[PDB]
């Protein structure tokens, strides 16, 4: 067929009860994240695609870059919490591996000060429970998908996309090839 299982995608031989509709893994250290969101901007094309009432939910992970990465997990967090993924993800990617300015949770803490949250807003948010509980979440669903890498993206819990599987020609063709996989799976 032209979906196929081990091509495409792969099937969790555990499906996670109550997982988000479409769920991508990244890290703010990972070189082959800031190409899938700066340059291939993947997250983006899959939404485009989706079917209407299907959300699309984004994690970071910790295992990289020791204690920053997991400042960046608790950040990341805040994000959530405060709506404002959308206004720091450009600039935290490009902290940490463009300009690299960003080597310390002070420095994590700019980005967000320099693109209009209060400081108040963020600190507050930083220390509450709301955010632990999220980087809770965020650690959870890794454990649930039993994560090896990132970039990684899982479709309602059963679904695992295989990039290794899509053609790597033109960046284009592999970018529709995986949004295109991403609602193929979201159907199924």
Not at 50 to 64: A, I, W
Not at 93 to 106: M, N
Not at 113 to 121: L, P, R, S, T, Y
């Given at each position: 067929?032209?979906?196929?299982?081990?091509?495409?995608?792969?099937?969790?031989?555990?499906?996670?009860?109550?997982?988000?509709?479409?769920?991508?893994?990244?890290?703010?250290?990972?070189?082959?994240?800031?190409?899938?969101?700066?340059?291939?901007?993947?997250?983006?094309?899959?939404?485009?695609?989706?079917?209407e009432?299907?959300?699309?939910?984004?994690?970071?992970?910790?295992?990289?870059?020791?204690?920053?990465?997991?400042?960046?997990?608790?950040?990341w967090?805040?994000?959530?919490?405060?709506?404002?993924?959308?206004?720091?993800?450009?600039?935290?990617?490009?902290?940490?591996?463009?300009?690299?300015?960003?080597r310390?949770?002070?420095?994590?803490?700019?980005?967000?000060?320099?693109?209009?949250?209060?400081?108040?807003?963020?600190?507050?948010?930083?220390?509450?429970?709301?955010?632990?509980?999220?980087?809770?979440?965020?650690?959870?669903?890794?454990?649930?998908?039993?994560?090896?890498?990132?970039?990684?993206?899982?479709?309602?819990?059963?679904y695992?996309?295989?990039?290794?599987?899509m053609?790597?020609?033109?960046?284009?063709?592999?970018?529709?090839?995986?949004?295109?996989?991403?609602?193929?799976?979201?159907?199924?």
């Amino acid at each position: 067929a032209q979906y196929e299982d081990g091509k495409q995608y792969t099937t969790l031989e555990k499906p996670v009860a109550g997982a988000p509709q479409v769920l991508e893994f990244f890290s703010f250290f990972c070189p082959h994240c800031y190409q899938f969101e700066e340059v291939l901007h993947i997250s983006d094309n899959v939404k485009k695609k989706l079917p209407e009432g299907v959300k699309m939910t984004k994690y970071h992970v910790n295992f990289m870059g020791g204690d920053l990465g997991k400042d960046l997990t608790q950040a990341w967090a805040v994000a959530m919490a405060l709506g404002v993924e959308d206004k720091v993800t450009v600039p935290l990617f490009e902290g940490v591996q463009k300009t690299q300015t960003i080597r310390s949770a002070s420095d994590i803490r700019d980005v967000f000060i320099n693109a209009g949250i209060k400081g108040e807003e963020y600190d507050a948010a930083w220390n509450s429970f709301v955010v632990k509980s999220l980087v809770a979440q965020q650690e959870k669903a890794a454990a649930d998908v039993q994560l090896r890498g990132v970039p990684a993206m899982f479709v309602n819990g059963k679904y695992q996309l295989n990039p290794q599987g899509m053609d790597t020609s033109n960046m284009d063709v592999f970018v529709q090839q995986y949004a295109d996989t991403v609602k193929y799976l979201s159907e199924k």
